[PDB]
Amino acid sequence: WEIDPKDLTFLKELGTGQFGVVKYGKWRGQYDVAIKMIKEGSMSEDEFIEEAKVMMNLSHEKLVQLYGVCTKQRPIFIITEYMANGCLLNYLREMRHRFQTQQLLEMCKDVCEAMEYLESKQFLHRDLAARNCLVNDQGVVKVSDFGLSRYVLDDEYTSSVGSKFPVRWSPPEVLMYSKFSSKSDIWAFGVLMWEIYSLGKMPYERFTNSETAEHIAQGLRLYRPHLASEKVYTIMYSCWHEKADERPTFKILLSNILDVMDEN
Numbered sequence: 001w002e003i004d005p006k007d008l009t010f011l012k013e014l015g016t017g018q019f020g021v022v023k024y025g026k027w028r029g030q031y032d033v034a035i036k037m038i039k040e041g042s043m044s045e046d047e048f049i050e051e052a053k054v055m056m057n058l059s060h061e062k063l064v065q066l067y068g069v070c071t072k073q074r075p076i077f078i079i080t081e082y083m084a085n086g087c088l089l090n091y092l093r094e095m096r097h098r099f100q101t102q103q104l105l106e107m108c109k110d111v112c113e114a115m116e117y118l119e120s121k122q123f124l125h126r127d128l129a130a131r132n133c134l135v136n137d138q139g140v141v142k143v144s145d146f147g148l149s150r151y152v153l154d155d156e157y158t159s160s161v162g163s164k165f166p167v168r169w170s171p172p173e174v175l176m177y178s179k180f181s182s183k184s185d186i187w188a189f190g191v192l193m194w195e196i197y198s199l200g201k202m203p204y205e206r207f208t209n210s211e212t213a214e215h216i217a218q219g220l221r222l223y224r225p226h227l228a229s230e231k232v233y234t235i236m237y238s239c240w241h242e243k244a245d246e247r248p249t250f251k252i253l254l255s256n257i258l259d260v261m262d263e264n
């Protein structure tokens with residue numbers, strides 16, 4: 001979907017991300033959207049454009065939809081669904097004292113439903129984390145910016161020893177071999193569950209990235225957050241099997257989460 005930029009009305013600055021400035025606006029004066037203005041040199045643009053239709057056809061209630069692109073111009077735009085409460089990481093930290101544990105589990109279910117859909121399309125997120133989930137005006141969590149890490153032009157992000165690489169969300173086979181798969185998204189989802197139940201703490205805080213890599217390679221795992229029941233912790237821990245083929249699928253994880261909800 002090539003969106004006509006004449007149909008976009010820019011309204012507010014939303015800050016800066018890995019591709020530069022993002023704005024809040026409207027499409028045809030009615031629909032709320034976010035507009036990424038892709039900073040020159042920040043993205044493998046020809047590669048993204050050549051391959052972008054698959055990402056737009058990803059359609060699920062728990063994904064932040066990629067509505068379309070503007071490519072007849074410089075800089076190019078990526079137009080997405082707008083989420084009024086911003087990223088999950090900040091939402092957890094700002095509302096820390098108000099969450100009931102049932103709401104935390106509901107957040108995990110939201111993300112797991114999105115990831116099961118992506119899994120069913122054999123589409124990898126590659127940077128799943130609370131910072132890359134967003135929250136709408138009714139508290140629904142949705143997964144954002146799935147697949148875009150592949151187009152980043154930034155050595156500090158693409159190198160596993162770079163300061164921006166998502167080391168704390170990465171399984172050993174990503175850290176050692178750059179082997180991304182459905183099972184590396186599974187690992188990251190476990191860390192995301194830990195972020196949710198810790199109410200937005202940094203995983204492996206006070207460890208550097210390389211200390212984190214060193215110690216998870218030797219079997220160090222994140223502790224059980226106080227608000228996670230043992231059943232919940234068993235689910236997130238199952239995502240962190242050293243061997244990728246011993247990790248569940250998102251279909252299994254979703255069944256596990258629903259069973260806890262039913263038992264609750």
Ligand SMILES: Cc1c(NC(=O)c2ccc(C(C)(C)C)cc2)cccc1-c1cc(Nc2ccc(C(=O)N3CCOCC3)cn2)c(=O)n(C)c1
Pocket residue numbers: 014015016017018019022034036064080081082083084085086087127132134144145148149150152
């Ligand atoms: C998403 C985003 C970015 N990252 C990126 O592009 C980006 C690019 C690439 C990657 C990888 C390739 C590395 C994976 C990751 C991220 C940067 C900047 C913006 C947004 C953003 C904010 C929204 N939404 C709101 C809404 C409200 C507020 C807010 O200020 N508050 C919330 C309520 O309480 C008061 C304060 C803030 N953001 C919203 O909907 N989308 C769709 C988007």
